[PDB]
Write a protein that binds this ligand. Structure first.
Ligand SMILES: O=c1ncn2nc(Sc3ccc(F)cc3F)ccc2c1-c1c(Cl)cccc1Cl
Ligand SMILES: Fc1ccc(-c2c[nH]nc2-c2ccnc(F)c2)cc1
Ligand SMILES: Fc1ccc(-c2c[nH]nc2-c2ccnc(F)c2)cc1
Length: 330
């Protein structure tokens, strides 16, 4: 393809002629895809090979986006570099279907009915079942990572306001063996906020976050305490004033009881006891949307590179191969 060059907010964009009307939103632009007639979101990766971590991270983001082919997950329409060889290669651009806003754009100033909450959370979980089936934990699900178009159709972005608020208490405790239900926690927090119009846990730091989480869900019971390896975490938790799990009907008063029932299955304190994305999609709150024959699972995802300790030039070369081997969704 033929490329053109421009400057948008100090950043320099070199993209094929097919992409027109670049409009600022790595750095991100909205554009018009003349080949398909659709509006797209285009991401320029900043300093992709600045260091080993940046290089592995560049490779990681690209491998992820190439694998994700699900309606409620962000995937790739296109990948390109203006580089005409591996040695020249120092820029990665990723393009996807533009939705046009995020969930935080919607919630704000806005009251959503129970049917809208059903539709939205159904989609998040449907997307998560797919992600979790590829052995991927999102880890940072929040409103700003949920892209929503005007039909209220939703795509999860950015797997690999304040992030803190939607984060699982075991991540706040700094447990290194947290599981996928860390994402179910976030969805529970996201749902709560759509039903109520306020942040369920607006904490000022990691300590306050945990404190307000335990006020709703209670202090750990015996079963959970037995699983905490760290003496200091336990000293702390058990030195707080003990707290019962609050009645979720009292707290979320006026909400569809089916939505309150799902809420408390998602926000169970012990992560071993939290509902999975697949289980949640079968919950009666989504009877209107659910179709087991249309909640697909992902092909096997090779994350074995995660363990590997490579040179910058090695991650670069690998990323280069992945740019070149790209075949669009068509
Ligand atoms: O609608 C969107 N669709 C996609 N993205 N992607 C990205 S990042 C990105 C990731 C993978 C790509 F292939 C390309 C990328 F740009 C950032 C925003 C975004 C939006 C969006 C917009 Cl355009 C405005 C306000 C809020 C959001 Cl969430
Ligand atoms: F079928 C088509 C052909 C061209 C366009 C178009 C509209 N504005 N700019 C372009 C354009 C500019 C430079 N290179 C291109 F490939 C496209 C749209 C649809
Ligand atoms: F105050 C607390 C105590 C425990 C948790 C917790 C929730 N799910 N899993 C854990 C957990 C399991 C094993 N080791 C840990 F450190 C944490 C969260 C907050």
């Amino acid at each position: 393809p033929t490329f053109y060059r421009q400057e948008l907010n100090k950043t320099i964009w070199e993209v094929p002629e097919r992409y027109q009307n670049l409009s600022p939103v790595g750095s991100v632009c909205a554009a018009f895809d003349t080949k398909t007639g659709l509006r797209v979101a285009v991401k320029k990766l900043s300093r992709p090979f600045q260091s080993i971590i940046h290089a592995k991270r560049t490779y990681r983001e690209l491998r992820l986006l190439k694998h994700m082919k699900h309606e409620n997950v962000i995937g790739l329409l296109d990948v390109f570099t203006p580089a005409r060889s591996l040695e020249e290669f120092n820029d990665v651009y990723l393009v996807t279907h533009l939705m046009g806003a995020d969930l935080n754009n919607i919630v704000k100033c806005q009251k959503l009915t129970d049917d809208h909450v059903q539709f939205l959370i159904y989609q998040i979980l449907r997307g998560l079942k797919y992600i979790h089936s590829a052995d991927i934990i999102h880890r940072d699900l929040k409103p700003s990572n949920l892209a929503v178009n005007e039909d209220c159709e939703l795509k999860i972005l950015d797997f690999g306001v304040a992030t803190r608020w939607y984060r699982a208490p075991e991540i706040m405790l700094n447990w290194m063996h947290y599981n996928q239900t860390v994402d179910i926690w976030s969805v529970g927090c996201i749902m709560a906020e759509l039903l109520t119009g306020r942040t369920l846990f607006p904490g000022t730091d990691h300590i306050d976050q945990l404190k307000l989480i335990l006020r709703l869900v209670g202090t750990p019971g015996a079963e959970l305490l037995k699983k905490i390896s760290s003496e200091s975490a336990r000293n702390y938790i058990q030195s707080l004033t003990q707290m019962p799990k609050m009645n979720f009907a009292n707290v979320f008063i006026g909400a569809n009881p089916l939505a309150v029932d799902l809420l408390e299955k998602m926000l169970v304190l012990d992560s071993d006891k939290r509902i999975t994305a697949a289980q949640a999609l079968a919950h009666a709150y989504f009877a209107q949307y659910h179709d087991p024959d249309d909640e697909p699972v992902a092909d096997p995802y090779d994350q074995s590179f995660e363990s590997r300790d490579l040179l910058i030039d090695e991650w670069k070369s690998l990323t280069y191969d992945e740019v070149i081997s790209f075949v669009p969704p068509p």
